[PDB]
Design a protein around this ligand. Structure first.
Ligand SMILES: COc1cccc(S(=O)(=O)NC(=O)c2cc(-c3ccc(C#CCO)s3)c(OC)cc2OC)c1
Ligand SMILES: [Zn+2]
Ligand SMILES: [Zn+2]
Length: 585
């Protein structure tokens, strides 16, 4: 194993020769520990509060879920405890028959995904445009520096020789150039999966990449029209820690479809930074803070370019295998059998495979499956054996599914069908309101002026008018924030990092205009393109559903808040100063 990771460790070792030591009190049990050196502690024990949102959401100052979100520890203490709880595990190797089925499904799935698309290398100018159309960070400074690209070419030459000198996963401008350089190289070799939308619904059948939150509900509603059993949405306990060496080897079959110059670089990414990895993690000691240098041959690194796509691929594969088990194609004896018959797996994939993928909505580790019948609830042999053990349920307890798509959890949301005053139906996204308010009340980082804080508040208020308008409290709060923040101020920073976020709320354009564009114009499931001219024609959940999902409607504190909200608006206005403001109440 030292033949792949050696050069990276030797460099860190040499660079930190003053403080390099082998700490014998290290907590690594499944990760290989190479040594430590001294660092300055990074992180915060709590999270910075957005005072603009907090002032306009008074009834939530006392809500437990709202307070909990305002915490979250990124210090070496918090960092060590998250590592201990999840990341320091070992997944038992899947049985020989399970490995055989997985391998056959992986080959077939890769041929299907690349039936119209051809893999290709991504470029410096693509990476440059992405960094630029995100920054408006020291990443835009690096991208503009020629010496950064020279380090990239040096590293790539080592990768062409099957060597790695500086691609280290992190749990001076030199270390940062090595980090951004590692991400460019990964973007170069595997970025095509994201950039050329290999996991779009049209290309993957089960995928939902590029759809966006406002469309996931409609996709769930279309899956419900297919004959079969209930809709299952089982959560995996730490999906990324459950990615095995057999998973990684199946994921790399994609290199067979690549041009030779591309294959070489993708192989270097797999073999050197996925199937082997050098990791840096901060640890508090009595003497101070240290950086630990660890390594391992499996698991997925969350902060990686290929993570979403390769997780979507492996989950699509794992769910097809569970469907085969559910249908009787895969038995307990088959899973234990190394000399298992490939023919029936092939026959099922070639005759039923695409139809079976159409029954699913898969986004990373997130899945919804509508099997042909309910035998699927008890088809747990392959799932547990593959290592995709379900979260908070005994291993052999049958899965509980839903006979109503509106009750199905997917991507931290559930989805409602609303009837508009004009008779038209909308499918809207919903999540517990405490999470939405809790998230909006968090400002990202320290040393942020009122302008930047208010603008982030406007971005959250505008995300709510576009996605969560059907929530009474959120439409009021959103109007209140847009009344307190100057009209010509542009929403800054991001409200979310989700791949399902398209950020149409990042504008000074009228929100009712953006609403019509998303929900009417661009909406393929809205046949009648008649615009909605007033927000009074933009619907709400029924009071009871609103209450079921976290609303404070019907509470005295909420009535007191709604009554006194112009007073709070004026206090934010008077503190921001003399600018142009608009009354939305
Ligand atoms: C990923 O892991 C996290 C962990 C903690 C925090 C966060 S976060 O605050 O940065 N984001 C979310 O909580 C969050 C947001 C969304 C969306 C919101 C609006 C959207 C739209 C549109 C139309 O284009 S999409 C979403 O949609 C599926 C899924 C999300 O989470 C699973 C993320
Ligand atoms: Zn490298
Ligand atoms: Zn809801």
């Amino acid at each position: 194993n030292m033949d792949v990771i050696g050069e990276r460790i030797k460099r860190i070792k040499e660079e930190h020769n003053s403080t390099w030591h082998y700490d014998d009190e290290n907590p690594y049990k499944t990760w290989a520990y190479h040594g430590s050196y001294e660092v300055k502690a990074t992180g915060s024990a709590s999270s910075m509060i957005n005072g603009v949102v907090k002032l306009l959401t008074k009834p939530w100052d006392v809500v437990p879920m709202v307070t909990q979100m305002a915490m979250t520890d990124t210090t070496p203490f918090g960092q060590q405890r998250v590592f201990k709880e999840k990341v320091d595990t070992r997944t038992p190797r899947p049985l020989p028959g399970t490995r055989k089925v997985m391998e056959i499904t992986a080959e077939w799935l890769w041929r299907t995904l690349g039936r119209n698309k051809r893999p290709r290398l991504c470029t410096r100018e693509e990476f440059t445009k992405k960094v630029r159309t995100n920054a408006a960070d020291s990443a835009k400074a690096a991208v503009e520096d020629e010496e950064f690209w020279k380090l990239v070419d040096r590293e790539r030459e080592l990768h062409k020789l099957g060597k790695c000198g500086s691609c280290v996963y992190n749990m001076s401008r030199a270390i940062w150039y090595m980090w951004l350089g590692v991400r460019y190289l990964e973007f170069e070799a595997l970025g095509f999966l994201n950039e050329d939308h290999w996991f779009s619904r049209e290309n993957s059948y089960s995928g939902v990449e590029g759809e966006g939150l406002h469309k996931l509900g409609y996709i769930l509603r279309d899956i419900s029209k297919i004959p079969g059993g209930a809709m299952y949405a089982d959560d995996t306990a730490g999906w990324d820690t459950r990615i095995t060496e057999d998973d990684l080897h199946n994921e790399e079959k994609i290199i067979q479809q690549m041009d030779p110059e591309h294959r070489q670089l993708a192989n270097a990414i797999f073999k050197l930074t996925y199937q082997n990895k050098v990791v840096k993690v901060q640890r508090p000691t009595p003497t101070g803070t240290v950086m630990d240098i660890i390594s391992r041959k499996d698991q997925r690194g969350s902060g990686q370019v290929g993570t979403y796509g390769l997780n979507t691929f492996t989950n699509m594969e794992a769910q097809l295998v569970r469907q085969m088990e559910g249908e009787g194609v895969l038995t307990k004896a088959d899973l234990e059998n190394p000399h298992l018959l490939e023919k029936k797996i092939t026959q099922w994939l070639e005759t039923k495979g695409v139809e079976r993928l159409k029954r699913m909505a898969i986004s990373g580790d997130d899945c919804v499956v509508k099997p042909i019948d309910d035998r699927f609830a008890n088809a747990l042999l392959a799932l547990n054996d593959m290592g995709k053990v379900r979260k908070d349920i005994p291993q052999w307890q049958p899965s509980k599914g839903w006979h109503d798509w509106q009750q199905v959890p997917f991507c931290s949301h559930h989805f409602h069908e609303l009837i508009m005053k004009d008779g038209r139906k909308l499918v809207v996204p919903c999540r517990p309101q405490d999470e939405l308010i809790g998230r909006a009340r968090i400002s990202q980082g320290a040393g942020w002026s009122l302008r930047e804080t208010a603008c982030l508040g406007k971005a959250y208020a505008q995300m709510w008018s576009l996605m969560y308008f059907h929530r009474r409290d959120l439409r009021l709060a959103s109007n209140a924030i847009c009344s307190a923040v100057p009209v010509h101020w542009v929403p800054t920073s991001r409200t979310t990092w989700s791949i399902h976020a398209h950020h149409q709320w990042m504008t000074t354009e009228d929100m009712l205009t953006v609403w019509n564009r998303v929900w009417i114009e661009e909406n393929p499931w809205m046949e009648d393109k008649t615009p909605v001219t007033t927000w009074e024609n933009v619907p709400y959940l029924g009071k009871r559903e609103d209450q079921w999902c976290g609303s404070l409607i019907g509470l005295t504190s909420r009535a007191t808040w709604a009554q006194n909200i112009p007073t709070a608006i004026q206090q934010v206005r008077s503190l921001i100063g003399n600018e142009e403001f608009l009354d939305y109440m």
